[PDB]
Design a binder for these strands. Structure first.
Ligand SMILES: Nc1ncnc2c1ncn2[C@@H]1O[C@H](COP(=O)(O)OP(=O)(O)O)[C@@H](O)[C@H]1O
Ligand SMILES: [Mg+2]
Length: 430
RNA sequence: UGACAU
């Protein structure tokens, strides 16, 4: 049964703009990161939000958001997108990739307006934004409303675990910007509720994830859909912190004469995260987690685990200890997942146990410690995980449990990530 | 394994 109607998004102005992490002590160190731009005829980067040829109201929304100065990815992607070019954007976690695409797209939607089309119940969005998880899609949706606040733009969302008709009937009214998880998006496409015949911008957030074996078929069904306008007559944008060369190659099928902007080393960890490791047997992990939480009372802690099974187990373990713990993973009801995330953000619960479902994109204020109870199999997922802390120039801590019986294969990539980020390398990862 | 329509 899927009947959950999520609460309606706040139309409280202050609350819409307060959905942000305030910049931290090292925000100005973003100026010291080497920017590599490759591709034909890159337009010059902009120097400030004031000198970015943005519309008065769009600029005023950026300033309402709290932002005073663009990050490196924004300095580059903004003029690139407004020139009409395709873009692969790589930049570390917590450095403002979302606004890098929202702000200019919102600008061009307003500056170069087209009348909406919704014909025969079938909406034709001018922007499709896809992301690999439901809570990230909702987050992106709320950021789009922030930067498009007070304008005539209509943003809609589409993701699973919600009542299909609630989202469907809303989309049917028409929307400029549709933000979606792929499953629910294709559902509406195959029902003739959404069509790609008016698309001006496609955006893959976490694009390296979207292009891997798990999502590539769903990406093809969008990019190559019969209703989709061809690559030469629309813009495609792809952002991530991580981007293996083999995945970069696959991206080029959907890109037209594109610019590749990489801020710092591709796939590098944020240097604002202190990365610590504890060597432990599979048995010892439980005791070591308890110990780490005991040594950190009053801190907001995000605990990553491999299985949904272990997520449920760890939440139970910590809860029976009398610690207020939320859990988020794919076997939980959608309502519960959104409530766990909200309880964790609000501070009601200081501990959140998560599978990889929360590894990418989520922007949670004041995560003090990210704990990898289980390390992931991919270094790129590790980079994203620890990036849940240390954002926008604030400093954070990651503590990862290393078990050689499980994680030996990761050691060479960990060590490289550590050295790139100026982190000490324990003897057991050498 | 883990995300991703019902
Ligand atoms: N130019 C800026 N100045 C201050 N804060 C910003 C700026 N750009 C983005 N932010 C904030 O930084 C946080 C991280 O943004 P996000 O787009 O999630 O980063 P990324 O996608 O690179 O991980 C968000 O809370 C966002 O509101
Ligand atoms: Mg992001």
């Amino acid at each position: 049964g899927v009947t959950y109607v999520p609460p309606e998004p706040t139309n409280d102005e202050t609350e819409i703009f307060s959905s942000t992490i305030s910049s931290g002590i090292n925000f100005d160190k973003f100026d010291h990161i080497a920017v590599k731009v490759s591709g034909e005829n890159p337009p010059r980067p902009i120097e400030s939000f004031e000198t970015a040829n943005l519309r008065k109201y769009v600029l005023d929304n950026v300033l309402k958001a709290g932002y005073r100065k663009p990050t490196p990815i924004q300095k580059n992607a903004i003029p690139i997108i407004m020139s009409g070019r395709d873009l692969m954007g790589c930049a570390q976690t917590g450095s403002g990739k979302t606004a890098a695409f929202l702000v200019p797209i919102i600008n061009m939607l307003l500056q170069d307006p087209k009348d909406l089309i919704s014909e025969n119940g079938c909406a034709q969005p001018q922007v499709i934004i896809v992301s690999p998880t439901r809570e990230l899609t909702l987050q992106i949706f709320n950021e789009a409303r922030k930067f498009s606040y007070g304008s005539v733009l209509k943003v809609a969302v589409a993701y699973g675990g919600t009542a299909v008709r609630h989202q469907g009937d809303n989309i049917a009214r028409g929307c400029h910007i549709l933000v979606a998880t792929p499953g629910r998006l294709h559902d509406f496409v195959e029902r003739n509720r959404v069509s790609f015949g008016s698309v001006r911008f496609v955006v893959l957030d976490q694009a390296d994830c979207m292009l891997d074996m798990g999502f590539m078929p769903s990406i093809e069904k969008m990019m190559l859909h019969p209703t989709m306008v061809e690559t030469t007559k629309r813009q495609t944008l792809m952002f991530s912190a991580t981007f293996p060369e083999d995945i970069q190659h696959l991206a080029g099928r959907f890109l037209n004469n594109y610019l590749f902007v990489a801020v710092g080393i591709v796939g590098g960890a944020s240097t604002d995260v202190e990365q610590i490791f504890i060597e432990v047997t599979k048995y010892e992990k439980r005791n070591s987690l308890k110990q780490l939480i005991e040594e950190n009372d009053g801190k907001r802690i995000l605990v990553f685990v491999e299985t949904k099974r272990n997520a449920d187990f760890i939440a139970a373990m910590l809860s029976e200890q009398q610690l207020l713990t939320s859990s988020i993973h794919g076997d939980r009801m959608q309502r519960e997942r959104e409530e766990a995330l909200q309880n964790f953000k609000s501070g009601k619960h200081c501990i959140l146990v998560a599978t990889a479902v929360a590894a990418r994109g989520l922007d949670i204020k004041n995560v003090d410690i990210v704990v990898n109870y289980d390390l992931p199999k991919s270094i790129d997922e590790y980079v994203h995980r620890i990036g849940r802390t240390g954002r926008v120039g604030n400093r954070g801590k990651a503590v990862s449990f290393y078990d050689s019986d499980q994680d030996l294969a990761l050691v060479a990539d960990l060590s490289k990530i550590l050295r790139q980020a100026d982190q000490s390398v324990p003897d057991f990862l050498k």
